């Protein structure tokens, strides 16, 4: 429901929040694209380079 | 190697130049001193043979302002008090109201305050070589600076209903301020050549 990975150890993962998306079915392409997308993490988004 | 000679020579076409740019008067020969002209004037066995004779003066072309000025070149680095207080009574006996000193390098601060008091009606002023060697007035980015009489200053403050603190200021440590020899409060009329619409005359003061 939340995505926040509350663990005594980060499980060797940089970021610890926003791990889940909601399968927004507004449109079928939005659906599939939600499934197949990947992301690198806002730890680099905070970094404009 | 011996580039010191060209240095101290060039220091004059900034010193003898600093006679008018002040209002005093000097032979057009002291402004047209060639490189070898200086050597011929101040020479000797050396090839160093310049010192102990680099000292001149000038009197006003306005015939007033009480009195005249005298320039001098103290070759000894960091002249200190044992050379500074000494070269004041020369100005006094010669009735030289204002004197000009040049030192290289690092004039000691301890031997600056105690002379700054005995200035009084006189003004030791102030420069030192290696920093003022060519005429900064000879430049593209510096407009024409002209002093003003309290007559003209009164006229300016009358035309604009001002108080003498409502105008733009110039700090005293400005190179052009000391160059012009400014007292704290006198109004400079500068001539901006800002080439967007003609050249005009702005006004500044010193506090």
């Amino acid at each position: 429901s939340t995505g926040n990975l509350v663990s005594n150890t980060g499980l060797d993962l940089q970021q610890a929040t926003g791990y889940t998306v909601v399968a927004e079915k507004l449109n079928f392409y939005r659906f599939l694209s939600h499934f197949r997308m990947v992301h690198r993490g806002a730890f680099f988004a905070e970094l404009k380079t | 190697e011996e580039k010191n000679i060209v240095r101290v020579f060039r220091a004059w076409k900034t010193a003898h130049q600093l006679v008018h740019d002040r209002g005093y008067g000097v032979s057009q020969a002291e402004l047209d001193l060639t490189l070898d002209q200086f050597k011929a004037m101040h020479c000797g066995m050396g090839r160093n043979l310049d010192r102990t004779t680099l000292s001149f003066y000038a009197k006003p072309s306005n015939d007033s302002n009480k009195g005249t000025i005298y320039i001098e070149f103290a070759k000894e680095p960091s002249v200190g008090i044992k050379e500074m207080r000494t070269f004041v009574h020369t100005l006094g006996d010669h009735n030289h109201k204002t004197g000009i000193l040049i030192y290289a390098n690092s004039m000691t601060p301890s031997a600056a305050k105690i002379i700054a008091t005995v200035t009084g009606q006189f003004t030791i002023e102030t420069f030192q070589e290696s920093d003022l060697i060519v005429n900064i007035t000879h430049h593209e980015l510096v407009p024409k600076h002209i002093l003003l009489s309290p007559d003209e200053k009164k006229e300016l403050l009358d035309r604009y209903k001002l108080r003498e603190t409502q105008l733009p200021r110039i700090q005293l440590a400005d190179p052009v301020a000391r160059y012009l020899g400014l007292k704290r409060g006198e109004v400079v009329k500068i001539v901006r050549r800002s080439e967007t619409s003609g050249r005009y005359n702005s006004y500044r003061i010193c506090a």
């Binding site: 079915k25 507004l26 449109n27 079928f28 392409y29 939005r30 659906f31 694209s33 | -």
Partner: protein, 98 residues
């Protein structure tokens, strides 16, 4: 991005806006709507497949989620209201169930 007519023609930023916006289209989000407990869904009533298509639009079974229709487009500076990217809609074709 593959489901794009002649996608190898337009300057790439256009294709990029194409993906990002086509993911935000008012088409059918599915078929079994009667039992959808969602917040906000969107469905368009009169749908048809394109005339121009890449084959994989038929292969991937996209026949079961049309997202637009096929319009009679005429590029012309006629009206004077369609500049700054603007566009006009035939009244008749609109009331006719566009």
């Amino acid at each position: 991005a593959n489901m794009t007519p002649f996608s190898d023609f337009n300057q790439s930023p256009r294709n990029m806006y194409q993906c990002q916006m086509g993911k935000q289209t008012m088409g059918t989000p599915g078929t079994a709507l009667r039992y959808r407990t969602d917040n906000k869904l969107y469905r368009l009533q009169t749908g048809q497949t394109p005339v121009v298509r890449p084959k994989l639009h038929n292969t991937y079974g996209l026949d079961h989620y049309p997202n637009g229709t096929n319009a009679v487009v005429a590029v012309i500076s006629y009206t004077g209201y369609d500049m700054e990217d603007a566009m006009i809609l035939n009244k008749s074709a609109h009331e006719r169930g566009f």
